[PDB]
Every structure is written in C-alpha cells, then in structure tokens.
Write a protein that binds this ligand. Sequence first.
Ligand SMILES: *C(=O)/C=C/N[C@@H](C(=O)O)C(C)(C)S(=O)O
Length: 266
Amino acid sequence: GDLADRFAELERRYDARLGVYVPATGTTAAIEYRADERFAFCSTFKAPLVAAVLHQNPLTHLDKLITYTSDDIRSISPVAQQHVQTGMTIGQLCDAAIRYSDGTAANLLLADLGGPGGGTAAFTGYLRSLGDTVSRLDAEEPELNRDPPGDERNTTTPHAIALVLQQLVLGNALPPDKRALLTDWMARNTTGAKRIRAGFPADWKVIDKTGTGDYGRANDIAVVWSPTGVPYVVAVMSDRAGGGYDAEPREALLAEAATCVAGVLA
Ligand SMILES: *C(=O)/C=C/N[C@@H](C(=O)O)C(C)(C)S(=O)O
C-alpha cells in the first residue's frame, strides 16, 4: 500500500492539512508527508527554547530567580500566574514551559536569551546553529500562535523541527546532563495525552511537547521508544486554513496520524 494515501484520507476526514516527519534510522526509512511545508510552531518551540537556555549557561543558572508581575501574564501561564509574588527560577520556568506549555515562562526564557526582539532573534539563531535554515521565531506569546496561514513568521517544517529534536534528545547538541534535563521535562509533559501518545501502544515510551493555535493548529513533537528501547523522532503538525481563524484544532487527527506511524514502526 501507500502511507501517503492514508495520510491524505485523514486530511479529507478531518478537513485539515497534515504534516509528518520521522527521520530514517539504522533500520528504518524516513516517514514524510508534506514534511517540507511550513506550519506554525505554536508552543512546540518551547522544547528547543529550553535547549537554547541550557546550551548557553552552566547548570547553576537553573537556580537563577526571575521576578515578574501580574502584568507580565499575557498568555496562558498555568504555573507562572501562581508565582508572581515569589518569582520562579530558570529551572522552574523550563519545567513550566515544557510540561504546562506556560506562555509567560517561555517569554521569560526568551528574555533570558536576550538581545533584540525580546529573545526571538536569539532563539532563531540557536536553530541556525543546529543546521536549521528554515525555522524562524518572530513574536512572543501569545501572538506567535495567531498569524494568518500565509505568514512565514513563527513557522517551521516537520522535517526541520524533527531534525532539531533528533539532535537535542538523541544527538550530541547538548552534553549528557543538559540532555537528560530536556528529556525528563518532555517525558513528564502534561499536555500531550491525546496526541502522539494516544497513537502509540502503552508499552512504548513517549516524550513530547504540544502546540496549539489559530486556524485549527494542532502540533505535537515527540521522541518515542519501542518496547525494546529503540528510539524514533515523530513530528506531527496540522491546521485547517480553510476553516477560519477559529477553526477547531483536532487532537484526534494527530492521534490517528501517530497510529499510522506506529503501524509502520512496530
Ligand atoms: C501553545 O501551543 C499555545 C498557546 N496558546 C494557544 C492555544 O490554543 O493554546 C492560543 C491560540 C489560545 S494563544 O492564547 O494565542
């Protein structure tokens, strides 16, 4: 048969555009579907953002206390809005940014990278350093989730983001100790149970970072491990450009796409 047909059938059924990339491995071919089309990052950028902060600092930096006010809560911040009085360490912010997709935490981590545009230029530079000539981040939370479909700002490609995550989690872009921190935060993500996780059998490990936004945007990037401990990177991205800015994102589309991918990999 042809996996591409079955992805196209998902697009028809969900009235959505779907993007998939699984890098080839020692024993498997790549899986690609619209893998070089652009899709908005949404909150999926927070995994490589945490990697950028890790990369650029000794681990003692994770204890640096960042202070902020209620006026800094400008996006959905489940953790940060309950710590305005005490503030949050860079480590706590990393934790929140990944595991709770904390917007304010992401904005504070961007500010930590520093430079023009509140850290957005710095973030894009980190991606360039990892060989990503495609992806760009141009806005903070929450604006980065809400560009129209035709806007290249704040976009990546399944192919590009997959190769970034491969390096970070399974490669040598980070030293082992920084890598383990990123891996753990993603492994204990709380937002992802209905996406790639829901497409893989329960004896597979899944670590992930979700993203959600306007025009029906639903993304998930994961690293999965087979029951024998063989790893693969899975990037799935979707949107519904024809359904209006308020089109409903479809978690089940990512879960079904992931099921298709598990069938190939198992
Ligand atoms: C991260 O992926 C997304 C954060 N926020 C978005 C979401 O759908 O959760 C929005 C579009 C609501 S954000 O307020 O722009």
